[PDB]
Amino acid sequence: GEIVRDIIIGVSDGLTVPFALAAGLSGANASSSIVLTAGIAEVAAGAISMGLGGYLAAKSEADNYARELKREQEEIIRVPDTEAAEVAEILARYGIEPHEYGPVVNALRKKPQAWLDFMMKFELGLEKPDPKRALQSAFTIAIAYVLGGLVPLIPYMFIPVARKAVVASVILTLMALLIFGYAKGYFTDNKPFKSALQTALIGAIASAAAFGMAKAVQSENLYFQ
């Protein structure tokens, strides 16, 4: 689930922080337009950091694994037996009788591709990356982040009073958390009814955190300024 995981980690970040930041700013008697200006500035700034962060990790792991793929094939050139010795240990660790693993290395020495592929598959994990899924990763997380952050900001666009709009945003995102919480469970091995309530509580813990932090800095101001 490459593209399924990318759109899940992107919506959970964009549903919780922009909603929490909005609710916290609305709690401190800020104008609804001000709540929108910091939310959208967060949503835009958030999608780029999530997006390029998903592209930096994907493009770094894709370049490294392909370089180690080349670094390991050059090792079997200079000292072939040392590379054979490393692949022999892989077989040996899993309890193979010596009269059966011996002919395996002899066949592996003639054809390099299969021996290295399995050895690398058994030593450094599945490290051959899809070139199109590296950039597909970044566009899917940035889309899911923008979509997630837009949901808590919709009511502030139609309600110019923030203390009135935050009530529409609490129930709308709470519904969004429970819906996209049970969605992450229908496409996961866990129970979707458990993932719905968990995505709504992380939105509650974060919205409460941003609320308490918003009011502790406004503790000395008479109005929001």
The residues in 65-84 that bind Zn ion, with binding defined as CB under 5 A, are 72, 75, 83
Q: Which of residues 6, 13, 42, 83 is near Co ion by CB under 5 A?
A: 13
Q: Which of residues 1, 70, 74, 103 is near its own copies by CB under 8 A?
A: 103
DSSP 159: -
Residue span 85-124 as binding mask against Zn ion, x where in contact by CB under 5 A, dash where not: -x--------------------------------------
Establish if 127 lies at the interface with Zn ion (CB under 5 A): no
Residues of span 8-67 touching its own copies by CB under 8 A: 9, 12-13, 16-17, 20-21, 24-25, 28, 30-31, 33-34, 36-38, 40-50, 52-53, 56-57, 60, 63-64, 67
Q: Kindly state the smallest distance separating residue 76's Cβ from Zn ion, in Å.
A: 7
CB distance 52 to 138 below 8 Å:
yes
Pick the closer one to Zn ion by CB: 15 or 119: 119
Residues of span 127-186 touching its own copies by CB under 8 A: none
47 CB-near residues (< 8 Å, 6+ apart): 14, 141, 142, 145, 146, 149
End-to-end CA distance of the chain: 46
Q: Kindly state the smallest distance separating residue 136's Cβ from its own copies, in Å.
A: 19
Q: Kindly state the smallest distance separating residue 53's Cβ from its own copies, in Å.
A: 5
Query: Which phi and psi (to 5°) does residue 107 adopt?
Result: -65, -35
Give the rounded distance of the alpha carbon of 14 from its chain centre.
11
Pick the closer one to Co ion by CB: 48 or 168: 48
Pick from 192, 195, 191: which is nearest to 203 by CA? 195
Establish if 104 lies at the interface with its own copies (CB under 8 A): yes
Q: Kindly state the smallest distance separating residue 85's Cβ from its own copies, in Å.
A: 19
Establish if 6 lies at the interface with Co ion (CB under 5 A): no
User: Environment class of residue 81 by beta-carbon count within 10 Å: exposed (0-12), middle (13-18) or buried (19+)?
Assistant: exposed
- Alpha-carbon torsion 67, 70, 72, 74, what sign? negative
SS (H, E, C) 18-54: HHHHHHHHHHCCCCHHHHHHHHHHHHHHHHHHHHHHH
Pick the closer one to Zn ion by CB: 13 or 83: 83
